[PDB]
Symmetry: D2
Subunit: 470 residues, 4 copies
Amino acid sequence: QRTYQVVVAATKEMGIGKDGKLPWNLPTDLKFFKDITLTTSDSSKKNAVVMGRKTWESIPIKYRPLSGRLNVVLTRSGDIANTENVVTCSSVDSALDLLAAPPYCLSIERVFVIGGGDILREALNRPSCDAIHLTEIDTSVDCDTFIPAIDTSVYQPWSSSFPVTENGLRFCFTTFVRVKFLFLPKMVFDQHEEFLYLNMVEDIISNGNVKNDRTGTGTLSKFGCQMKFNLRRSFPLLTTKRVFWRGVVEELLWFISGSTNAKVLQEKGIHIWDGNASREYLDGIGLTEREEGDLGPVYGFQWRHFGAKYTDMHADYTGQGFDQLVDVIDKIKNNPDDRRIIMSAWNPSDLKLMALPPCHMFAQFYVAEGELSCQMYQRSADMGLGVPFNIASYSLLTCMLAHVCDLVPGDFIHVLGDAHVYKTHVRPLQEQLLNLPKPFPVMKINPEKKQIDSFVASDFDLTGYDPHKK
Amino acid sequence: QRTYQVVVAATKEMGIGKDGKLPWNLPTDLKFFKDITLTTSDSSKKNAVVMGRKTWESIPIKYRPLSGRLNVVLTRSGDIANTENVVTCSSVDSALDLLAAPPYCLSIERVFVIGGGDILREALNRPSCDAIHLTEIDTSVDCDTFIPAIDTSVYQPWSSSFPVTENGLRFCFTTFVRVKFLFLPKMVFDQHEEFLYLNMVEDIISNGNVKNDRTGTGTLSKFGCQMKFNLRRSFPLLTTKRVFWRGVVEELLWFISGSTNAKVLQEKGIHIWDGNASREYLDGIGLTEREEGDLGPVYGFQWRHFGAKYTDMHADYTGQGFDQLVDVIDKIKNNPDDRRIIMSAWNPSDLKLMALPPCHMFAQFYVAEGELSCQMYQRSADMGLGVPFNIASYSLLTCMLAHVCDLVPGDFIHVLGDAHVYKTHVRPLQEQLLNLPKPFPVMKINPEKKQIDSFVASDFDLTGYDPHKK
Amino acid sequence: QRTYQVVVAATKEMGIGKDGKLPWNLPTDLKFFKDITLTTSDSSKKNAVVMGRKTWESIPIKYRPLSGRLNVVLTRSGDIANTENVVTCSSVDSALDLLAAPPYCLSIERVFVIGGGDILREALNRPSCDAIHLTEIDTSVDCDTFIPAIDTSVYQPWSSSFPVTENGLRFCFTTFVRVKFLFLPKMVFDQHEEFLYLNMVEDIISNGNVKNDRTGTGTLSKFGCQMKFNLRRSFPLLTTKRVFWRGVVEELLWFISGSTNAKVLQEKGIHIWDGNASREYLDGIGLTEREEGDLGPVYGFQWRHFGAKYTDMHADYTGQGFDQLVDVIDKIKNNPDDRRIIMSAWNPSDLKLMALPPCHMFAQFYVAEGELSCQMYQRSADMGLGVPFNIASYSLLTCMLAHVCDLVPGDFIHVLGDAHVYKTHVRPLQEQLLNLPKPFPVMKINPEKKQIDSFVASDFDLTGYDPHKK
Amino acid sequence: QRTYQVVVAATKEMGIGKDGKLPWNLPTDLKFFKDITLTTSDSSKKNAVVMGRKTWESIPIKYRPLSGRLNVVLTRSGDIANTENVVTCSSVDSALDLLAAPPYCLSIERVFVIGGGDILREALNRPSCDAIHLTEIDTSVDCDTFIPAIDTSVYQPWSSSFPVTENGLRFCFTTFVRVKFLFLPKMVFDQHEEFLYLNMVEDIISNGNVKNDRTGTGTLSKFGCQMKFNLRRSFPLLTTKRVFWRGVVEELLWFISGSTNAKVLQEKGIHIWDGNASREYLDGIGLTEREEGDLGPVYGFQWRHFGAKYTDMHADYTGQGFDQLVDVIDKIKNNPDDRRIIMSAWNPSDLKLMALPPCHMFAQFYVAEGELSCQMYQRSADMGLGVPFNIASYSLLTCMLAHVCDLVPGDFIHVLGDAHVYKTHVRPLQEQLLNLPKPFPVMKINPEKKQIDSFVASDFDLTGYDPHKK
């Protein structure tokens, strides 16, 4: 018995039809439907499209059957002629049985169920459903026929397209996978956004500039890179190698608090700043007066008190300097179209006082269609360690700001200056590049928290994060 | 008599062979050679490759003739058999005569001359040479055969690839055109970097988010865009619409001087800041004390005196605040691998004093292979007006910094936040988008100027700038 | 002002619609329509489809616009939005004006007019109509809308497909050209049946077996070749080199008469048998008793008197042997489904008496769908001389038999045994192969002749035969 | 451990190299090598080419590695750098182990071993060799390196191309399979000549003309069909359905003997003529005087005594009429280039006396390059029953005539007039069309028989005939 994937277009209210018609015209979705049902890995094989009599008859009489595919119509007249391109069958169960048998065992690369309302209510959440390819349409236009909600206990988002507007309607394409993933069409498999990271790492190792510094540490490097992650359906925590999510969460709440005390993190078991806060390190960069843990005026201070005179990590800076985080929140709520929604840790006057100069040195925010997007500029990007952490960090910040400002998250755009791989990390990164991505996890923030200073680690729920091993 | 294009690989010293061999192995260049000679617009037609007996014999006896193309060998034995795929001819002049005649008049889409040394010394700078496709190899390895330098009086760069390293050698692909340009292969035509701008404008007008502000001005906008321009062979001054080059030059020398006085520009006939410096404008944003022309602590001041206390445009700020431009020049010369080569106009403490907040808000520099690259972050990008000006501005800055630091320019990377087209500019921009790019101009800086403060407008030579009309 | 081609489907009665619907469903014709309008020589360029508002609205609202092509709708509301893919225009004349202008001057490879009834009545027989691509449907099902008959004074058939049956309807695809022909789509250009001959000649010269005989005459030869010619819309008299049509007609009427006297042809100025009938020739093959001109029991005798005892060319053989031609005519009229409709000149008993053994040695006839087809076996085929003559000869015989038996001609199938080119003819044949075919002529037989023995040369009308020069 | 296929070019003497060079230049074979190693079913996957260091170094330094494929070089220096496209391995066994492991488990569609002499002597006849793709070169030019003969006990021919001449050398491409066959490249799988039959049956059932006769028996029919079978490496006895080989052999020896007595076959247990020889049948067609079994002057009589006066099946016709079979044998031996090597059962004078008119009504023979070819004209072709039998019959006749005339068999060309499927056979034929062909068998004739009249059934050896079940 063969397995199948569902292809369906649906309103917010999960509606699929008006009066035996579609209450929308979307040529981009028709093309997607064509592309995903027609095209094959093997140019010799073809796909099966399984549909109800109602769906078969809905198709204009000229364009029947759906060209290029074996059209399986399910029928119950006890009235439709079988051909090379058309087969009748009594049930979904029987169609699946037939396609597991010669000649279709070899002839048919994949099987798509495409409706109508009756067949989808059965098909959608059966375990032999490998994947659902949903066109999500942002409308509430009246529908008479509905399908169930996707069962998110057993389906997880693989990919979700950048939303598009056609004929007055906003929509996107979201693939869910039942939880290999190699059953996906190649075109959908390749849409996993983790490949934007993996292809960049490959490109830097293959084609980076070779370089060196005063300690004899070596690097392969590229200059001026961009990666864009969709936050709408899933959260880009890398799956090819475990990311330190707990440290992402704790470090960001620490930044938001305005703290420059590494001991606040050390006390919680987060050691990522320990190397830049030690007696030995501070001595070694000429800060012999500075207290262990006092990083100086780094991110937290610049974000909450830009321009204030720094003294020590213990001073009360209340009402001193410019509170960029409060300013950003104010613009997002009260002037969403503003082109200066900016928060920056880059303060040339203060660099001499900092245990380390800011690397994620500025972010801009944008609002459209009720969604909050973020673009962050990273001057120095270690692909192996820092880049996956920073993707998760600014994606989280985007989600928190959207949440507190009564919006939904849009996209995170990651801009890199000097993007490098250490010569020593080339071997382990090439092992990591043999791993195939798993679906990203889904991240939910506690609805009872509405104020940027009021979060704790337990407010962030990650579901379905199972990355490849150490 | 048909026209032709040259395809050749050459060292810095313009060398093409060692001892009847190539002193390099570059599979990427062999593939380029294959791609440009083999592929056609029409899948029915084919190309002619014209070569000398020496070149014909150089080809291993197994891979003759060059498959997929009509191979025209020029011969002078008073010893080589004509076929469907091989034609002998007495001269370049005779080969060209033959291909202008049936059946080759229809059968042959384009004609490529590919050597050897004798035929290229004739072919390279004949007026029936439409274009030269040069593989430029960064080596000085001994050669016995040489071709002339490209005659830059009659050839201009169309496109030049991002340099690549293969088998220890650095190289790139540069197409020169004789000065339509529709004779170029489609693949080379499409490499003109002006299409990066034109495709972005189209994409924003087609798919931008619709928006509005408190005066009833309307926009189509996208968030998080990147364009990368090659500065190595030509200068990206847009050709589909004239760019105000003189104002680019004067404004940048003004920024470098540290001046915040718009009258310095007004006095030279540059009015681009007049709107933001007028009694009326300054009044209207609550700067009623501020003198006409006093923009406040804008780019020039932030670049030369970041962090200093601003008073008026007349004050001597010598030794006050942080001189970012001097710091950048110092790092480029003395620590080229530094990951903090940064100059920023973004100073939240000073925004209240500025006639307009900085829009081009930060640039980072990078050095590798003797080349200086720049990445600039623009928070607000009017595609119609500001973006072409700013491309020219930061490309010029990159060139000036390379010049003063004894380097050559690499790439300019343009990063956009809110990238928008005014609803009112959609009609004129769609007229502009019907224009086909002309080759970019070539920009030379006076060698006798070696200090960043010592330039004047006459130090910048632009050759071959002929943009489409108003 | 650009030129165009018409694409239309039409009944026998030249009907195109029933009640704003099509009275047929033909997926093969929809695919043809798609293929000819969509596909381009240049994979970068596209085609324009020009249509009336009525045609635009007829298209289901989902599949608008026609994907892959610039859709030009002609409108007269004094109500339809222009896009990248949709342009409104006031007239055919205005649409053509617009597509001759940038950007469409380069952007648009070819222009197709596809209806509806109003636009076609104007477009069909305008001189800027290069070609008509008609789907001819063999039905009389009621139509309410009609187009004019094709004006055969100015349009000539280029190609006509082997008829196909789909959904109970018989139809074919016929291209007419206005009388280069290089304006045709490549796919339609290549359908000219003269290429079946030209590709065979090329294949024998390129890949034939080299051979020799007892006089030192040399040949390139292949064994077991087939060519199929459509007689339904045009008559396969080769255009790349003039065929001796008058001798075809006279020789065949001579065969039909039963004559074996070469002087009957000599007396009319037809000398093709003179070489095989001369005192010298007959002596040289040991027929020293035989009269000049007496060929012996060759085609005419075998066809009308198979098995009779031959004496001389002057004897009255009335009622002697088997009259194969009368037998064939009887089966075609009275038993059309017979699998033995055969006429053969192959009589081993008689070979010793023949001036030359039969070369076109047997033909079989077939009847289906009111059409008479013929398959002829030629044991020895000179590609340069005999094969074009014999194609015309048996195509004529097929037409005459169809005419006398109240049928229409179907196909002529030419089967070759030893298919050869003389080494001496390779040079002239390679000159001939540079000629592009012109449309075949159209051949009409006098309706007042109804009996196989009653024809004369003036009964055969050839229109539009203009072959390439000597 | 993955499986592999060998790709190699070899002389008659099984030689592969001269002095580390190839003693031939064959661009057609280089293209075949490229096509079979490069192309994949899946456009995403690629192939592995496994080769010896000697083979790796033999490749000109410019065209390394073989583009488009994973190049696995086997090495034993205790000197060659691994890349994305190049992997070193210690053995064939180790290379196969590595390609069965990630990422190559998914990345690599098929594995080809391509030499040199050392690796092939191991690889050629190992059980993990699925197939051998041999270019067979008709030359005896000196070679220094040889591979073993193909072990015909375990390898059987799948397909063998029509021989081609390039650069003075005759050669062909022969695939052997180890005895699914779905491991073959799609291009080689589709070359099985049994598909020429299967595609014709499909084409007649899908597109034949519907017809009927005076008993209410129905047919689908096409007119003018050709199939060409290669006899050089295997014998075309259909595998999708068992062919009655014993009756083929007995009927043909019966034809050759000149017998018209069906009892000669009945007495041996061959009943195929019983239906046309019965008291009842002969009565029913008005031959009430004729003896049971006396078929009249049918094939055997026409072949050995064309033109003689028939009396009964018992008469001694010695020296009466024309002995076509002796004439054919004489021309094949003594005038092989003759264009009249013909044997015909078509005698219009005798049709009234025949129990059934001849259906296989004429054959012509051709000699070139030491090979005997045959073209046979069948006026009436039942695709289901008669056509497979007749293919085997005339292929056998071709083999017997080649054998007795000291030649090798070339091609059998099957020409059909009325080619039909009975409406009643459509269902069983559509079952048969689900069967995938098995390799044809190999047929050997007893060398001690040299005279056409001296054969018996035991002189014909068929090896490897295992057709699909009833």
